Structure formats: structure tokens, C-alpha cells
């Protein structure tokens, strides 16, 4: 007991010493020689209306046109973002949904929430209506995030401090990821879908191997609950938004925090975070009803996306980087370009 | 106009979806949403019976459809999902009166702390609370031998069922920091009482009328 605690403390000290030794310079002191991105002015182009409750999640399709959103009114709406047409409206058995995922193939959609069940709906049914194809159960906490890897496997994070990679056809947890001491609030899948980062309420993010199934890395530095996480497009870094007013960029290979994006005028929490196509711009949704676009290399607040009357709950960027969708508690999705 | 036949039919489908969504929202707006809360075995199961994650109980009383959401067994950080219940019509908080002589930290003190946290959080500033002081039949027997001074040493009243119940109710109501803007509907229930649903109906009727006054710009 005491000996094991002392050994754990020694290992943590060794890890911190290695991190400090590898921290020869900082990204801020390196990116002083590059020009700033200037004032980013993303104007709103589409406003998606039809959700009648607070919108909690939203995921873009890989075609960068179809967009799924989940609202507390028990609705999962699939939008044609180009024409603002409602392609699909799925009634949910549980109206307390906090996450939704869109399959890369587009044939399936996912949702989940306080029911502790990840519901997967088939969009390409022969009967022509969207029917529930799977109900993955086994998590003992609320479903906070879910992300498809393919049409048969999905990684879902829960409030029971664990994540799970499932087999949709069998309905069983292929792999269980445990080690977070707090509720896992977000997930992000690497571009190769071989690793994924999960941030939890223990103010910690964990890099997990999907196939191997163990925690590859652990990242700390946030002072409160981590609510959002997103891989950098390169796949060697990821950004975390926390309940404090700080976003933090961590590098996988350096195993360290690179930069902190924060301002004294910002004091509210962070709900969503995402990168642009190049990763130069970091878009974060805040409780102050606004979104902030930061220069990911210089930590300068490049711009502000304002126009939501309530808390910005979900944020997403298209695979082609064409537009940014922001869903807020005011029951509207806004597309910015 | 500048739309193909398939585009026009897709727009028609979107309009039909909009109409269905409006109908569903109108139907759901007339439903009374209750959030069932408690410190544990405080009678929530009995209340649900007489009236793995979220549990939903649907029941129609006097032309009002009630959806009661029980969050027991979640066993996670409440602050991470309590904001989902911001718009509920009311919060039904169940407290076991006989728990004053039990401990987990005293059970009654834990119930009071949970009630304070639920009432005074940023998400339930104006939400009304129906306080169900359950197990009054067992509390009457317990108060005959077990004094209330075990839970509240400051209690100077006589060890009687009525006085002790009134003191407990006053102590629970004193946890409200926004008494002007929020009302607490304390009720006493023992077992299989048919008047509990009527009390809930009256409380939610008052809440609904107040909400209608607020929405119409009249309050």
C-alpha cells in the first residue's frame, strides 16, 4: 500500500522530469517568426431551425453536406446543410441525449445520453424509414460521446469513467478502456482511427490504443473538468477544452502541453473544441454564448463567432474545412463561412 | 423557381418534417415535467409506484400528462447532467422522516445538504419543489422513544410527532435562499396515499399558471 504509493509517486516524478528535459523550447517562442492569421471574420450563412429544445450534440458527415444534430426534445435531425432541408427526423426513445455521431459511410447514425445506451439507427433501410438498428448497452453511466470507426465498430465514452469500443453486429463491448478517475466527457478519433483521446472530469486526457486496448499516454494540466477534445489534423496533437477558461494543446510525440489559449476577459467554461482543415485555427465554444477562434500556433484570439442567444454546446468543422457548424442551447444550428 | 423536381419534393419532405416537429413540440409543451430526487431510500420507489439510467414514468391525471424522471442509480457527477433538467416543470424531492435517527454522516443531514444543493444551484433558480416527507407513520413511532435532538440538537420543542414534523419542515424550507422567487410545496405521506397525486396536481397547476403569467408578459 504505502510502498506502492511511493513507487507511483516516484514514477510520476520520473515522468515529469522526462517531460521537463524534453521541453527545450516552447511553441510560442518558436512561432514568433510567422505572420499572424489576422482578424478572422466568419459570417453566418445557414441557420438550421426546427429543434424545439436545447441542442446537445452535432456531427458533420464526411460529404461535408449532411449534418446530424441531437436535441433534448427527443429528436435527431439530419440536415442538408447546403439547402437547410431536413433530410431526416428520428424520434428517440430517450429524450435525454448528450451525444450523437454520424458514420463515415453515412449509412448509420448514433446517439446516446442519460439512458446509458448507445442507439444506432440505420439510414439506408429498404422500407425507407430510419429504424433503430442497434442498442448498445453495458455502460453504467450517461453516454457523453460516441464516434464511429466503421459501420460495425464505435467508441463510446460514458459517465462511469470508462470508454468502450463496441461491435455493432454482436452488440457487445469488444474492448473496455478504464483508468480515468472521473466521468469521461468527450472523445476524438485519430485520422487513422488507431488511437483516440478521451478527456474526463479528473482534469486529465488519455491517449488510448483502439486495437491494443491500453492507455498509451496520459496528459494533465487542466485545472477543472475537461469537456471537449479534438485531434489535430496531423494526428500528432490534440486540443482540450475544460471547465476553466483555458484550451490546451498537447503533443502526442512530445507527451507535453504545447500552448494554452485563454484570456482574462474569458471566465466561463468550454463546451466544444475543433480544428480547421489545416489546424491553424482552433474553434472553441464557450458558455458565454460565443465561439472563439484562436491561432493554434500563436494563441492569439483570431476572431469571435457571435450570434447564438444561449450557450454554444456543440461545434464541428467539415472534412473539407468549408464551414463550421455551431449548435447552441437556443435550439438553433448556425453554419459559418 | 430555380429548383428541380427532386429539389422541390425534398423541400416538400422538409416542410412535412417541420409540421410533424411542430405538432410534437406542441404536444410535449402541454406535458408536465417532474424531476424525482432524493437522498436514497427516501420513498422514491413508493412515490413512483403510487403515481439502468434515466427512468421515465408517464401518467395522466385530471387531463394532465405527467412525465416523472428518476435519476437514481446514475452514480456519476450530477453537475455534468443536471442542466439537462433546467426546463422541468417541478422537482419532486423525497425525504424520509424516519431517517433522522439513521446515519450513512446523519441521513437527515445528508438529505438536507442534497436539498440545499438542488434548490440553490444555478439551474433551478425558479423551479418549484414539491417536498414529500415520507414515512411519517414510522416517524410517529420513532419520535415516541427517539428524540429529535439526535439530528437537530437546537430543537427545543417537545418530542411529539406534530411538533417534530413541523420543525423538520421548517428546517427544510429554511434552505431556500430565493424564497421570494421559488415556492416549496411540503407534503406528508406515509404509504399508498391517493392524495399525493392530488397534491402534485395542485402544485403543478400553480406552477403552470405562474409560468403562463410569466410567458404572457404579465408577471
Amino acid at each position, epitope marked *: 500500500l504505502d510502498q506502492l504509493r511511493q513507487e507511483a509517486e516516484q514514477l510520476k516524478n520520473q515522468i515529469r522530469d522526462a517531460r521537463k528535459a524534453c521541453a527545450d523550447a516552447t511553441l510560442s517562442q518558436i512561432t514568433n517568426n510567422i505572420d499572424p492569421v489576422g482578424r478572422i471574420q466568419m459570417r453566418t450563412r445557414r441557420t438550421l431551425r426546427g429543434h424545439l429544445a436545447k441542442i446537445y450534440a452535432m456531427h458533420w458527415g464526411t460529404d461535408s453536406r449532411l449534418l446530424v444534430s441531437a436535441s433534448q426534445d427527443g429528436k435527431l435531425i439530419i440536415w442538408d446543410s447546403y439547402t437547410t432541408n431536413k433530410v431526416h427526423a428520428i424520434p428517440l426513445r430517450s429524450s435525454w441525449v448528450m451525444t450523437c455521431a454520424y458514420a463515415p459511410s453515412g449509412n448509420y447514425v448514433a446517439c446516446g445520453g442519460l439512458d446509458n445506451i448507445c442507439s444506432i439507427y440505420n439510414l439506408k433501410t429498404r422500407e425507407g424509414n430510419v429504424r433503430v438498428s442497434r442498442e448498445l448497452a453495458g455502460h453504467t453511466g450517461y453516454l457523453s460521446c460516441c464516434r464511429f470507426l466503421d459501420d460495425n465498430q464505435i467508441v463510446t465514452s460514458s459517465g462511469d469513467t470508462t470508454c468502450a469500443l463496441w461491435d455493432i453486429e454482436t452488440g457487445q463491448q469488444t474492448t473496455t478502456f478504464t483508468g480515468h478517475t472521473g466521468d469521461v466527457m468527450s472523445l476524438s478519433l485519430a485520422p487513422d482511427t488507431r488511437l483516440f483521446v478521451s478527456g474526463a472530469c479528473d482534469a486529465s486526457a488519455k491517449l488510448w490504443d483502439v486495437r491494443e486496448g491500453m492507455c498509451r499516454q496520459t496528459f494533465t494540466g487542466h485545472e477543472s473538468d475537461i469537456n471537449a477534445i479534438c485531434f489535430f489534423p496531423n494526428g500528432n496533437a490534440f486540443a482540450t477544452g475544460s471547465d476553466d477558461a483555458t484550451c490546451r494543446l498537447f503533443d502526442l510525440r512530445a507527451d507535453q502541453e504545447l500552448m494554452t489559449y485563454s484570456h482574462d476577459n474569458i471566465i466561463c467554461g468550454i463546451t466544444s473544441v475543433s480544428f480547421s482543415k489545416s489546424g491553424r485555427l482552433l474553434l472553441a465554444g464557450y458558455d458565454d454564448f460565443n465561439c472563439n477562434v484562436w491561432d493554434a500556433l500563436k494563441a492569439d484570439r483570431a476572431g469571435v463567432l457571435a450570434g447564438h442567444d444561449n450557450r454554444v454546446s456543440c461545434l464541428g468543422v467539415t472534412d473539407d474545412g468549408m464551414a463550421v457548424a455551431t449548435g447552441s442551447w437556443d435550439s438553433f444550428l448556425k453554419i459559418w463561412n | 423557381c430555380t429548383l*428541380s*423536381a427532386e429539389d422541390k419534393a*425534398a423541400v416538400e419532405r422538409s416542410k412535412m418534417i417541420d409540421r410533424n416537429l411542430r405538432e410534437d413540440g406542441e404536444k410535449a409543451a402541454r406535458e408536465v415535467k417532474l424531476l424525482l430526487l432524493g437522498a436514497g431510500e427516501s420513498g422514491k420507489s413508493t412515490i413512483v409506484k403510487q403515481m439502468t439510467g434515466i427512468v421515465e414514468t408517464h401518467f395522466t391525471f385530471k387531463d394532465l400528462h405527467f412525465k416523472m424522471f428518476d435519476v437514481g442509480g446514475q452514480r456519476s457527477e450530477r453537475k455534468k447532467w443536471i442542466h439537462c433538467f433546467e426546463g422541468v416543470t417541478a422537482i419532486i424531492f423525497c425525504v424520509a422522516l424516519s431517517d433522522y435517527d439513521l446515519v450513512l454522516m446523519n441521513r437527515m443531514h445528508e438529505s438536507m445538504k442534497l436539498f440545499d444543493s438542488i434548490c440553490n444551484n444555478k439551474w433551478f433558480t425558479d423551479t418549484s419543489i414539491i417536498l414529500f416527507l415520507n414515512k411519517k407513520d414510522l416517524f410517529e413511532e420513532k419520535i415516541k422513544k427517539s428524540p429529535l435532538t439526535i439530528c437537530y440538537p437546537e430543537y427545543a420543542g417537545s418530542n411529539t410527532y406534530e411538533e417534530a414534523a413541523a420543525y423538520i419542515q421548517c428546517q427544510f424550507e429554511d434552505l431556500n435562499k430565493r424564497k421570494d422567487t421559488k415556492e416549496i410545496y411540503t407534503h406528508f405521506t406515509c404509504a399508498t396515499d391517493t392524495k399525493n397525486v392530488q397534491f402534485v396536481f395542485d402544485a403543478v397547476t400553480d406552477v403552470i399558471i405562474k409560468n403562463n403569467l410569466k410567458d404572457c408578459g404579465l408577471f
Partner: single-chain antibody
Amino acid sequence: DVQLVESGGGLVQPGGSRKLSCSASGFAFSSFGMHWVRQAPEKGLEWVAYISSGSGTIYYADTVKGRFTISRDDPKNTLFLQMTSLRSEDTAMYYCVRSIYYYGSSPFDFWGQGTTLTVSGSDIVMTQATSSVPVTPGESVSISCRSSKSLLHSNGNTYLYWFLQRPGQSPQLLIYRMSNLASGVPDRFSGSGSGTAFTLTISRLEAEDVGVYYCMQHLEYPLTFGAGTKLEL
């Protein structure tokens, strides 16, 4: 699974009225638009009428406008076509066609068996260069078609549909929007086009896809079909 059964055909004296019905099963009939399509005994397919989901929009061909009435009863999942003052030119096999419309959808994907009814100008015209093509299994066959107006729209969609009708069978959707392979269709069939001239290429052809190939336009609403390219041997 999906099933459309037609009824009400037979002998009708000229100037009479008949009520064709189409019972639907295996799919959410209320959420689909429904078409009535004619095929004369040897003159190929011809669009007749259409009713939208929820009966929002109702359309008829100029040949049957003012005489035919299309309707739908969603609770009983039935499609109705009342024909009054039937002429000698109305003798044909009638099909009820399921057709849904959203982004990425596959309309005209299911056709009913159809019933035979025997009676005692500015729209886009679709033409097919060849009427009968003698083919041998294992080869590649290219069926070509042309349109009076370019089927490419401002949204980038080219509304062309390739259907196959086998002998004794209802037409089956092969290609929708000139490039998309319909569900259940093998990768042998591929669609291509330049906006006004289109080709359908079949590789490693077998005896299972021998029939008449029809091209249909969906850009301008009055849906018109090609003459039909029959494959033999």
C-alpha cells in the same frame, strides 16, 4: 420485403371509368411519393401521374390530364387511380412506382407488377439510338441515349434514370441521377454522361440482365421515357 400489388385491370368499354388500386406493404407508404406509369403492349413505358408524400402535390401527364385522378389512402397504404372516359389509347399495363425524394435518395427504385387495362410538346424528349442490340454473354454493352435539353441542373445533379425491364417482369431501377448504382444492382452497370448525351455500360454481361433498357428524365417534371433499347441473345 417491399411489395406493391396492383388490381382493377381488365376490359373496359370506351368512354367508361375504372378504378385501379395499388396495395403497398413492407415499407412506410405515407413517406413515399407514388407514380402511375403506363406501358403499351409494344410501345414502351410512359409516365402517367404522381402524388407526393402527404398528397402535397399532384401531377398528371398531358395525355391523361382532366380525365385521370390519382389519390392515396395512407392509413390503409393504398394508391388509387380513377380513370374516366377511357379512350382506346389507354390500353396498357399500369405500374405503381414507389419514389422517395431527399438528398442522396434513390427514387423510382421499386415497381409494382402492374395490371393490364384493355379498352375496346415543350416537355423534354428522350431518344435512344438503338432499339434492338444483339449481344453475347461475357461482353461489354453500351446503351446510349440523348435528350432535347441538358439534364444537368444548377445544383450539379444530372437527373437521368436507367431502368431495366426483363421479359415478363416489371421495370427495375439500375441507375439514378446518371451516376449512382441502385441498391441490389451488381457493379456491372455503370452510368456516364456529358449533360445531354448519356451511356450505360455493362461488363461481363450474363443472361440475367437481358431485357429492354429505358432512360427517363427527371429534370423537367413531365417525366418522359426513352423508346427502349432491347437486348437479345
